[PDB]
Amino acid sequence: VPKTSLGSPPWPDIVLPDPVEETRHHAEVVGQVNELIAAGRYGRLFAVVHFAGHQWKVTAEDLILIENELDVACGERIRLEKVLLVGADNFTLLGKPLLGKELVRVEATVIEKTESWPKINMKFQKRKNYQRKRITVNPQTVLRINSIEIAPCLC
Amino acid sequence: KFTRSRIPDKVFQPSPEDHEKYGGDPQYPHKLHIVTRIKSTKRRPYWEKDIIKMLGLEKAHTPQVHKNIPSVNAKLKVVKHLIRIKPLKLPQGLPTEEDMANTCLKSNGELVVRWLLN
Amino acid sequence: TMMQRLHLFPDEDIPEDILKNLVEELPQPRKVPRRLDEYTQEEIEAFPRVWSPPEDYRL
Amino acid sequence: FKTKGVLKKRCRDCYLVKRRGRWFIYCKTNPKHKQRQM
RNA sequence: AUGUAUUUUUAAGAGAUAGUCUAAAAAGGUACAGCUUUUUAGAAACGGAUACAACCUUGACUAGAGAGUAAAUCUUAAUACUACCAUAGUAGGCCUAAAAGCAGCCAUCAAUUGAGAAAGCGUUAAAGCUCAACAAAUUCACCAACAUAAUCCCAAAAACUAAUA
RNA sequence: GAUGUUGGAUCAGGACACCCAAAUGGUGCAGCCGCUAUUAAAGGUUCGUUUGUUCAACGAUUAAAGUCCUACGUGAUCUGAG
Numbered sequence A: 001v002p003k004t005s006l007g008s009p010p011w012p013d014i015v016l017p018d019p020v021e022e023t024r025h026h027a028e029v030v031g032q033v034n035e036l037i038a039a040g041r042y043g044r045l046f047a048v049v050h051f052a053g054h055q056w057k058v059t060a061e062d063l064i065l066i067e068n069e070l071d072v073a074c075g076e077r078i079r080l081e082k083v084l085l086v087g088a089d090n091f092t093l094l095g096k097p098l099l100g101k102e103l104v105r106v107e108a109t110v111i112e113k114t115e116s117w118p119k120i121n122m123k124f125q126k127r128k129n130y131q132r133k134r135i136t137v138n139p140q141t142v143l144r145i146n147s148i149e150i151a152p153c154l155c
Numbered sequence B: 001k002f003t004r005s006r007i008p009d010k011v012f013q014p015s016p017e018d019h020e021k022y023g024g025d026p027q028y029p030h031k032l033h034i035v036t037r038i039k040s041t042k043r044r045p046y047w048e049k050d051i052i053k054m055l056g057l058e059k060a061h062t063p064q065v066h067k068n069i070p071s072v073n074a075k076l077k078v079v080k081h082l083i084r085i086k087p088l089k090l091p092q093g094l095p096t097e098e099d100m101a102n103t104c105l106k107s108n109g110e111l112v113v114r115w116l117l118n
Numbered sequence C: 001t002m003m004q005r006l007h008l009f010p011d012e013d014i015p016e017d018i019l020k021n022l023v024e025e026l027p028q029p030r031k032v033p034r035r036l037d038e039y040t041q042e043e044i045e046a047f048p049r050v051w052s053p054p055e056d057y058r059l
Numbered sequence D: 001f002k003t004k005g006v007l008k009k010r011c012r013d014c015y016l017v018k019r020r021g022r023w024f025i026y027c028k029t030n031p032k033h034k035q036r037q038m
Numbered sequence E: 001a002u003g004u005a006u007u008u009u010u011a012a013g014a015g016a017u018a019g020u021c022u023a024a025a026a027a028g029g030u031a032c033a034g035c036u037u038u039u040u041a042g043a044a045a046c047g048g049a050u051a052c053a054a055c056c057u058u059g060a061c062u063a064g065a066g067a068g069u070a071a072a073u074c075u076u077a078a079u080a081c082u083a084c085c086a087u088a089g090u091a092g093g094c095c096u097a098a099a100a101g102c103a104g105c106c107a108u109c110a111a112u113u114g115a116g117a118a119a120g121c122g123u124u125a126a127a128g129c130u131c132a133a134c135a136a137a138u139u140c141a142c143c144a145a146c147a148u149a150a151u152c153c154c155a156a157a158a159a160c161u162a163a164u165a
Numbered sequence F: 001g002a003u004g005u006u007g008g009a010u011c012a013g014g015a016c017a018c019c020c021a022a023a024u025g026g027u028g029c030a031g032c033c034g035c036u037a038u039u040a041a042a043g044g045u046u047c048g049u050u051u052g053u054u055c056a057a058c059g060a061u062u063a064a065a066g067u068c069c070u071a072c073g074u075g076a077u078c079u080g081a082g
């Protein structure tokens, strides 16, 4: 097997660590990040949330506009549950494909209940004499996001 | 002319390795079909549109369940190129009353009776 | 407009102005093959002589 | 010369050569056998 | 039987009755039409076939700064012919101006170790050139292809970091 | 609820299936003429008698007096013999 431009597969060789060393290394790394959470060294967190059929990027003091009516009194404090991502300058927690409740918590307040600005929808047809004009008004809900807290427990 | 055609019986006589290939059990045939509609009924002759209205296959990519009796099998045969057929499996057995609220149908073609405990 | 931001030079001669403001070197898309004389004697000696030539044949 | 669809050697002395990405029939004995494929 | 919810009657009503192409069976014509004439199917997307009425994917609402998929992006190719050598009855009969293998009929014989009573050209007929036969060797093949139009070519490019994307 | 239709005049754009000029193969090519085939479109491609005529005949010449297409080019430029 001499070297010809073909006989050698065109890509870098794959170096894959042993599962044992990886289990140790993981236990250790998770341990360390865990020490950062316990310490309180995370400056500001941002989260990726799944709400009302969309995904969002959320941080404390921020604002989002949800496209349908929720049944909540105005000013109540909601706790969002399905959480995809959590991240901070030094570290990031990734859910498969969801983050466990005990690990992280994100609490928002509903600010505004509104009807959306009129959306003009009109179908038309060439010389069939067909027009249909309809104006749409959509109930909307604005959320202030208050807090993202992250608990020490990670194993 | 164009016609309703026919399928000769040889088509439907399975070889021994087709059992191994599709994972059907050679000894016992299976009870229920899960039939999904993959393709459109447009551009197709009216009698096929009929068959698809009878099978309850009205809108695409929704599963349906049917018996494996010869009567239903005939119609399926007529439309067999528009549909997807898979045997329904019941690992946990038949659903009883208490489990009616907890039923779920997985893409294996597999019915799960107890779904999402607490 | 973007056509204006492209600068083409026939050889390698470029005004000090354009040389001085260059950030980054792009990788060559095609891998240029070597000639015969390029190969280190190590590499040529290292490659198998595939067939056995007869002596009485003139080359 | 002749422009032809199919070249065929007319005698024993026609040799068949490819030049300029065409097929020619050249003949030294008689010139009238010269042909050129199109 | 079976899978479904449709069908028949009764009472009122109109429009419509100047169709196109695609697949299939046929007619007529030129086994010609974006041709005409019937019978059975399909179609008339805001997505593909760049552009597009008929082909293909899909059937349908109203919002979303979400997702999974469908038809589909345009690739396919095509080559050579080589040695060395050549006497014999006998220009076999028959014809024919001549007829000598080689104008046609008959015969296909027999020397040499090996050479057809001859497959080519050639000559008025001869004469003369090569093929088949040994002798010397080496062997690898054979089934070959096809000019052009009128304003100005018609994405640009590209052998390759892994795709049931 | 109009895309005004033959031939000329003027001005020509293009094709190459070259009539001339330019390089060449083959010849039943000695040379002179020729007859065929290949490659080449920058430039040329006449004046008259008779017909409304394109076509055609005929006189005289030219290196030649090409074959075509462009709404049988071109009438809000011209001419109407037809």
Ligand SMILES: [Mg+2]
Binding pocket: E018
């Ligand atoms: Mg009509």
Ligand SMILES: [Mg+2]
Binding pocket: E018
């Ligand atoms: Mg009528």
Ligand SMILES: [Mg+2]
Binding pocket: none
């Ligand atoms: Mg056509």
Ligand SMILES: [Mg+2]
Binding pocket: none
């Ligand atoms: Mg019909």
Ligand SMILES: [Mg+2]
Binding pocket: none
């Ligand atoms: Mg389109």
Ligand SMILES: [Mg+2]
Binding pocket: E060
């Ligand atoms: Mg829908």
Ligand SMILES: [Mg+2]
Binding pocket: none
């Ligand atoms: Mg002799």
Ligand SMILES: [Mg+2]
Binding pocket: none
């Ligand atoms: Mg003998």
Ligand SMILES: [Mg+2]
Binding pocket: none
């Ligand atoms: Mg008008």
Ligand SMILES: [Mg+2]
Binding pocket: F012
């Ligand atoms: Mg001109």
Ligand SMILES: [Mg+2]
Binding pocket: none
């Ligand atoms: Mg030419």
Ligand SMILES: [Mg+2]
Binding pocket: none
């Ligand atoms: Mg010209």
Ligand SMILES: [Mg+2]
Binding pocket: none
């Ligand atoms: Mg005209």
Ligand SMILES: [Mg+2]
Binding pocket: none
């Ligand atoms: Mg005129």
Ligand SMILES: [Mg+2]
Binding pocket: none
């Ligand atoms: Mg005009």
Ligand SMILES: [Zn+2]
Binding pocket: D009, D010, D011, D012, D013, D014, D027, D029, D030, D033
């Ligand atoms: Zn020859």
